[PDB]
Amino acid sequence: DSAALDALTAENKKLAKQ
Amino acid sequence: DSAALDALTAENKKLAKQQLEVLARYLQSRLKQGSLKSFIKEKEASAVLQKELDLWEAEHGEFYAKGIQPTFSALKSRTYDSYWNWARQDVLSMYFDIIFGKLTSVDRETINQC
Amino acid sequence: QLEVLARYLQSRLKQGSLKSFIKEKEASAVLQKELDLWEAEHGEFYAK
Amino acid sequence: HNAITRNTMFVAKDKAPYSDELEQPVYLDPLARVEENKKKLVFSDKTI
Amino acid sequence: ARYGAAGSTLIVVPFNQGSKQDVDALVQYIYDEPKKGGLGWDLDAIIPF
Amino acid sequence: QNFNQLNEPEQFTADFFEKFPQAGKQLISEEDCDYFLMLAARPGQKPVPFVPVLDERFEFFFKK
Amino acid sequence: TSTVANDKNESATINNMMKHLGRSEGNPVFGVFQKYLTGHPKGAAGAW
Amino acid sequence: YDPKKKQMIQEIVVQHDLEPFECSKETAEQYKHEHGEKCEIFEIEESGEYTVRILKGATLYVPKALRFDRLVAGQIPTGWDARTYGIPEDTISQVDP
Amino acid sequence: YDPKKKQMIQEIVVQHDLEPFECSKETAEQYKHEHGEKCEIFEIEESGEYTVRILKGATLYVPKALRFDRLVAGQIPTGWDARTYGIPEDTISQVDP
């Protein structure tokens, strides 16, 4: 789902920002 | 599809895990030295201790086991020596029994108290 | 970087490590307390 | 018995025995005594 | 309180006669001097019922 | 023991309050006043020939 | 105390005391208000 | 109040900048006033709230619990209520126990 | 006490695990007693001290300052000392001002 894809995008962005 | 999304998640997790192992190897930090080695070693030690305990409890039984428990403590000693106070207390208690009609000399409890 | 990656992976570098270990050490201490009770109540010869 | 059965043991007094007009006249008369009126003990100007 | 005569002292102690440690600790507590937390007593009778 | 002893209630009342002299000295408690008001309105009973209380049940007591 | 209610109430109280005790008209008491200079030290007020 | 878990707070100087947290403008300004160079406050222009970041060298109070050894007290019977004596709820909320 | 900088502490729930800090066994045990699953205590076998890690979801008290608007009080003159009246140092350290 788009919600799952956005969650994955947020997780990757979070790792990159950390 | 959810299968494709899970595959992407697994690929990202795999990359992160490989980077994690490379960094741990570089730092000489062992991700399973305090873990899982020490843990299975202490579990084996506990198994040995439990084997000795099972020997004791099978040789003696449950009642003997819970009965050999020490219970003595000098801090739980209760010393009673105030006969001096209890004498006057009992004298007065019997005196008011007499004056309220709860006691007569014929009763042998009176002679015992006296 | 190591801690950031472990946090991202939800891998705990001290869950199997050092928590399970101090817990099993406490359990072994309890067992050794019972064993010390038995051996102090009966002695070495009776024990062996 | 009424208070225990009805949880009315403490009856907060909403108003003083004297009105705002008779507050100070009662303060300044040592002989001012409350009188009964409608079953309530209140100060009246007749006693001031 | 009802029976303790002059000079009598009743010391109630917890004690497990089914443990060697209580036996040793109790005799040590009875015979040790008061300055070591004992009683400093010499038993004139024993009634192990 | 049985309410048939109340068919001659004056002497029974005298014996009862000779046994309980304190009853004739103590005012009726609030518990027993509430019990009395409930007995005065028990269903299946002839409504009492008096008015015990002036309350929301005053019409009930007055008219039944 | 340099508060509205306190100063008004205290002036009224002193005025009513003198009016009831028949203080001769034209003989006011002079009011001292030390707290203007020393502040209000709660308990030490009346002592100062 | 659990005497076996008597709550206290211990002062610690932080050796690392905490990740920023969100709060109102007033609280962020208060944080900056207290800490200063050891705090950092920044408006989220999208909403209006503020982000506060506590920096290295700042003082924090991390709670700790002390096993207190006075567990027994002579207490009014449990379930004692001022309501059962007719004291009104407003007085109960206003005055001290 | 600076009324323009009245110190207060604000309760915050942490959204990130703080880096471990070192302290004694007693203080680490107190921290674990208070927080529990939200704290991690471990002994440094090299020394004997303990490291305490505060985890996500724990409660911290971060100080804040409030610009208080009562800056004026009637105060005993500056430099007033009980020593000049002959009150001994031990009494000064024992008793209240």
Neighbour count for residue B46 (Cβ, 10 Å): 20
DSSP secondary structure letters along D25-41:
HHHT-TT---EEETTEE
Structure-block tokens of residue E21: 């440690």
Quote the CA–CA distance of B45 and B50 in Å, as a whole number: 9
Quote the CA–CA distance of B42 and B32 in Å, as a whole number: 14
| Strand, helix or coil for residue I60 | strand
G20 tagged catalytic: no
Largest Cα–Cα distance of chain F, in whole Å? Answer: 38
Q: What backbone phi and psi angles, to 5 degrees, belong to B66?
A: -80, -10
* Resolution, angstroms, 1 dp: 2.7
Measured in angstroms, the CA of E19 and the nearest CA of chain B are apart by 5
Measured in angstroms, the CA of A12 and the nearest CA of chain C are apart by 9
Quote the CA–CA distance of I22 and I35 in Å, as a whole number: 16
- Cβ atoms of I39 and I60 within 8 Å: the answer is no
The answer to whether residue C8 neighbours chain A at the CB level (below 8 Å) is yes
**To probe the interface with E, which of C41, C42, C46 has the most E CB atoms within 10 Å?**
C41
In the PDB record, what is the listed experimental method? Answer: cryo-EM
Chains G and I are in contact, defined as 3 or more C-beta pairs closer than 8 angstroms: yes
Residue bearing tokens 């009802």:
E2
Measured in angstroms, the CA of C19 and the nearest CA of chain A are apart by 26
Task: Identify the DSSP state of H48.
Answer: S
Chains C and I are in contact, defined as 3 or more C-beta pairs closer than 8 angstroms: yes
Instruction: Classify the C-alpha dihedral B13-B19-B22-B28 as positive or negative.
Output: negative
- Cβ atoms of E38 and E30 within 8 Å: the answer is yes
- Cβ atoms of H56 and H70 within 8 Å: the answer is no
Angle (nearest 5°) at CA C12 between H8 and H9: 5
| Strand, helix or coil for residue I66 | strand
User: Which residues have CB under 8 Å from B60's CB, separation 6+?
Assistant: none
Beta bridge partners of I8: I64
The answer to whether residue B90 neighbours chain C at the CB level (below 8 Å) is no
Quote the CA–CA distance of C38 and B55 in Å, as a whole number: 11
Closest CA to B46 of H55, F27, C35: C35
Residue type at position B103:
L
How many interface pairs between D and H have CB atoms less than 8 angstroms apart?
16
CB contacts under 8 A, D 5-44 vs H, are 7-12
Helix (H) and strand (E) counts in chain C: 3, 0
Chains that touch F (3 or more CB pairs under 8 A): D
Q: What backbone phi and psi angles, to 5 degrees, belong to B110?
A: -60, -45
* Helix segments in B28-104, DSSP class H: 37-60, 62-67, 83-100
Pairing assessment for the beta strands I6-13 and H59-66 based on DSSP bridges: unpaired
Classify each residue of H33-44 as buried b or exposed e, where b means 16 or more C-beta atoms within 10 Å of its C-beta.
bbbeebbbbeee
Instruction: Classify the C-alpha dihedral A10-A13-A18-B4 as positive or negative.
Output: positive
Cβ of A5 within 8 Å of Cβ of B5? The answer is yes
Chains that touch B (3 or more CB pairs under 8 A): A, C, E
